[PDB]
Design a protein around this ligand. Structure first.
Ligand SMILES: Cc1cc2nc3c(=O)[nH]c(=O)nc-3n(C[C@H](O)[C@H](O)[C@H](O)COP(=O)(O)O)c2cc1C
Length: 147
């Protein structure tokens, strides 16, 4: 089984979360392809993958905005091949702001409208992800056993 993980991370929290996810999947037998949103092209990006995990941090504060590297991919999500694709989302945020991990809802909602199958509720991490390594591994385990 092939799984693709694309993450948008500026201070490295969502990136750390992605690597933690990759390990879990990799150990469970998956062939994981983890890429930084900054280095990918939307066009047919999900082609050939059995599972796609999208991670992205939230910004803007006074409004909901996605991590800059992920925006291009988001704006072109209709060209990724999400139709019937088994996907799940995650991201890091800070409850101190008004819209906690809003980036995760935005991606989930658009993936849903594009015909993707969200196999698990998004992983929403508050603060340092390392302090939540247990929730991350479990979430990865959960999505993995629900495809
Ligand atoms: C200007 C600014 C705005 C932010 N807005 C939000 C927000 O709306 N919602 C949220 O959950 N976190 C918000 N955060 C917190 C970040 O999402 C948090 O620092 C996160 O760990 C960043 O992840 P990064 O390393 O993965 O990409 C904001 C941080 C800054 C500096």
């Amino acid at each position: 089984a092939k799984a693709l993980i694309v993450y948008g991370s500026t201070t490295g929290n969502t990136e750390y979360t992605a690597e933690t996810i990759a390990r879990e999947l990799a150990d469970a037998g998956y062939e994981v392809d983890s890429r930084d949103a900054a280095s990918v092209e939307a066009g047919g990006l999900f082609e050939g993958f059995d599972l796609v995990l999208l991670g992205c941090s939230t910004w803007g504060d006074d409004c909901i905005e996605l991590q800059d590297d992920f925006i291009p991919l988001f704006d072109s999500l209709e060209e990724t091949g999400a139709q019937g694709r088994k996907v799940a989302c995650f991201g890091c945020g800070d409850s101190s702001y008004e819209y906690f991990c809003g980036a995760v809802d935005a991606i989930e909602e658009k993936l849903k409208n594009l015909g993707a199958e969200i196999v698990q509720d998004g992983l929403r991490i508050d603060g340092d992800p390392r302090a939540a390594r247990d929730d991350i591994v479990g979430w990865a385990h959960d999505v993995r056993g629900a495809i």
